[PDB]
């Protein structure tokens, strides 16, 4: 029992540490309301992962981006959903904002089968301009075509085609502090399928050649579809974060992020997000970089 007490406290601090490392590297002052997210990660007692992230816009570094993945192998999805929403409510109270939940409500509907959930995340993407700040949630669904149809319908035409239902498992929800909300659909291709002719037919031949190059170093590929996106966002899951510079032509700002992370005590893999037209360039100007730590 005493072992559990030590480990509990240890995990709490290790999580805050990962968060502080990231914030302290890129922002002298924490963006409000980061301390509320810090309290939320602390309140979660099971096994989790954290994502710390930077969005680079030329020389603009946006670094107050964090996500928690519920990974306690009990599969208590409804419990985790209720904890996430409780946290979101607290943010509403302290900040004095009202979140628009309608897209999540319609997606959940009345009959949600939680046994079909394989990932749940909750988090923040915080700005100095409160209105531009957002709360985030992802839900990954397996063998739930009824819910896939719903999310596609909710996309409001950002869903490029109904043939993409074959590729979609992850659903993203953004909740802006100004009462605007967005849904995102992520079309995926796994590594085992990269070289299949059906995949070349339905996916690869629609992308320029430069978009295909980072697949060599990747275990997974998403295309993020949302009407909040200026362009389709291509996501590459690099097996080793060290390969970033080999496959992506980084600007100074993104190199700074890359440099900081090369020798942090974090997971070997990373995610990279960039618009298709950035890869056509001689130097990427707009890029999203995602780093991970697990806490068992």
């Amino acid at each position: 029992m005493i072992v559990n007490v030590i480990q509990k406290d240890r995990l709490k601090e290790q999580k805050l540490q990962f968060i502080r490392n990231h914030q302290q590297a890129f922002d002298v002052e924490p963006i409000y309301p980061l301390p509320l997210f810090e309290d939320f990660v602390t309140s979660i007692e099971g096994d989790c992962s954290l994502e710390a992230s930077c969005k680079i816009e030329s020389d603009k570094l946006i670094a107050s981006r964090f996500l928690l993945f519920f990974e306690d192998k009990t599969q208590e999805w409804q419990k985790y959903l209720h904890q996430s929403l409780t946290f979101f409510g607290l943010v509403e109270n302290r900040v004095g904002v009202k979140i628009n939940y309608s897209l999540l409500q319609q997606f959940l509907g009345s009959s949600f089968d939680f046994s079909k959930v394989t990932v749940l995340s909750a988090g923040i993407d915080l700005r100095n301009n409160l209105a531009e700040s957002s709360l985030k949630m992802h839900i990954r669904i397996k063998d739930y075509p009824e819910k896939l149809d719903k999310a596609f319908a909710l996309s409001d035409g950002a869903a490029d085609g109904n043939y993409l239902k074959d590729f979609v498992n992850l659903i993203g929800f953004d909740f802006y502090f100004n009462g605007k909300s967005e849904i995102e659909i992520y079309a995926e291709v796994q590594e085992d399928d990269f070289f299949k002719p059906e995949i070349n037919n339905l996916v690869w031949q629609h992308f320029p050649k430069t978009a295909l190059q980072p697949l060599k170093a990747s275990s997974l590929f998403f295309t993020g579809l949302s009407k909040a996106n200026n362009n389709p966002v291509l996501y590459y899951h690099l097996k080793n974060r060290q390969d970033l510079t080999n496959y992506f032509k980084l600007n100074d700002t993104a190199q700074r992020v890359h440099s900081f992370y090369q020798h942090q005590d974090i997971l070997p893999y990373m995610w990279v997000g960039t618009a298709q037209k950035e890869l056509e360039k001689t130097r990427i100007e707009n890029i999203r970089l995602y780093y991970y730590k697990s806490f068992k």
Binding site: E51, T118, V119, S121, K142, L220
Partner: peptide, 7 residues
């Protein structure tokens, strides 16, 4: 495998 894909 990773936090966005269970295995």
């Amino acid at each position: 495998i990773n936090p966005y894909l269970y295995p």
